[PDB]
């Protein structure tokens, strides 16, 4: 089992890098794939790729060796890079939900409203906020707790645990996860409501002749929507729930579980290529690249 854990890290890195490299290539190389939605997918794929290339490897070795081998500065820089890429990834999932909301419910409005320049500004903002939650507080020691046993891990270069004050653990978790999640629930709930209410109008149209039923296309939409919200929440809610818990009653949740739940979150970066790049044009480009 201890050897199974190390093998399982290797495939995680392979899936993340393979999948995301393949997506970014597909979008860059094909003229047809360069849509506005795929512009937000490109932001997402960059973040996830940096997770696979830098964050997960260094994270893997902290589990293998039981200790940080690259010193205090690279513990701080790596912690910042982790938070940056996770913040950018999850916030970008939220921006995508809004993009698809506008394009589905109000498609003619969406074309004039969401320009290429406006999409770039949104993307820049997602990354700027990711930076100011990650690099600004962590490098400047604002994330630091005053506790003595916490202050032992900051003094020790071999120790690279994630220990934060109350403020930072709450604020970072909200900005990286909870604001994005609530926006995604609100946004995608209205796509369900829009489709539900549209079935209502089609039934009123009939003059009591027919009652609409859920066909193929409605059940596929529900499955897709279930995968989007289900996989994202399965992967990141457990870690981010615990991350707020640990501030208040610290010994309540073990350390092995806290780390394992964080790794569950890194797995989402391997799932995101699969969920958000199933379009016919993506499937064709992927065949052309291989």
């Amino acid at each position, epitope marked *: 089992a201890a050897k199974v854990m190390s093998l399982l890290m290797a495939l995680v890195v392979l899936l993340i890098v393979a999948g995301n490299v393949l997506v970014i290539a597909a979008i860059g190389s094909t003229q047809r794939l360069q849509t506005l*939605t795929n512009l937000f997918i490109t932001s997402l794929a960059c973040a996830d790729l940096v997770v696979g290339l830098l964050v997960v490897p260094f994270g893997a070795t902290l589990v293998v060796r039981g200790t940080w081998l690259w010193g205090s500065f690279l513990c701080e820089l790596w912690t910042s890079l982790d938070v940056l890429c996770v913040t950018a990834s999850i916030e970008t999932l939220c921006v*995508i939900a809004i993009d*698809r909301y506008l*394009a*589905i*419910t*109000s*498609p*003619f*409005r969406y074309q004039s409203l969401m320009t290429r320049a406006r999409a770039k500004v949104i993307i820049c903002t997602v990354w700027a906020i990711s930076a100011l939650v990650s690099f600004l507080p962590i490098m400047m020691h604002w994330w630091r707790d005053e506790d003595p046993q916490a202050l032992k891990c900051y003094q020790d270069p071999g120790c690279c645990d994630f220990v934060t004050n109350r403020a930072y653990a709450i604020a970072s978790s909200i900005i990286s996860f909870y604001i994005p999640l609530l926006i995604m629930i609100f946004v995608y709930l209205r*796509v369900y409501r*829009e*489709a*539900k209410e*549209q*079935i209502r*109008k*089609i039934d*009123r*149209a*009939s003059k009591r*002749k*027919t009652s609409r039923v859920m*066909a*193929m*296309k*409605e059940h*596929k*939409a529900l499955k*897709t*929507l279930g995968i*989007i919200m289900g996989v994202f929440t399965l992967c990141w809610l457990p870690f981010f729930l615990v991350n707020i818990v640990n501030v208040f009653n610290r010994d309540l949740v073990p350390d092995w579980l806290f780390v394992a739940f964080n790794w569950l979150g890194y797995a989402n970066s391997a799932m995101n290529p699969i*969920i*958000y790049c*199933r*379009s*016919p*044009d993506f499937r064709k480009a992927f065949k052309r690249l291989l």
Partner: nanobody
Amino acid sequence: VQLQESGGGLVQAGGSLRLSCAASGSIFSINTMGWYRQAPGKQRELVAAIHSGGSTNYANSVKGRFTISRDNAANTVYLQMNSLKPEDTAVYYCNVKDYGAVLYEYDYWGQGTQVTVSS
């Protein structure tokens, strides 16, 4: 999903025509039906489109003259073309954009139906 197109033909300048595309098949509740056209030796351009929530979109060449509407019950879209000119002569295609995938749109195109207007 099959798009059956009718109402096209020959008509005199100043005349009216009513195109009608019925879409038989599985389509998501939320969708955008429209009419495109392709003049001889030109690119396919949008004429008119209507969202499942009543939103419309017209091209300036046909604004004020052409009116697009959709059948309340079934997936059928009508384009009432009035004050026709010889410029409007084209192969008019019916289009359905299905949003059932959520993350992307799927296109359906009809075979095309000839409209020809003379002066």
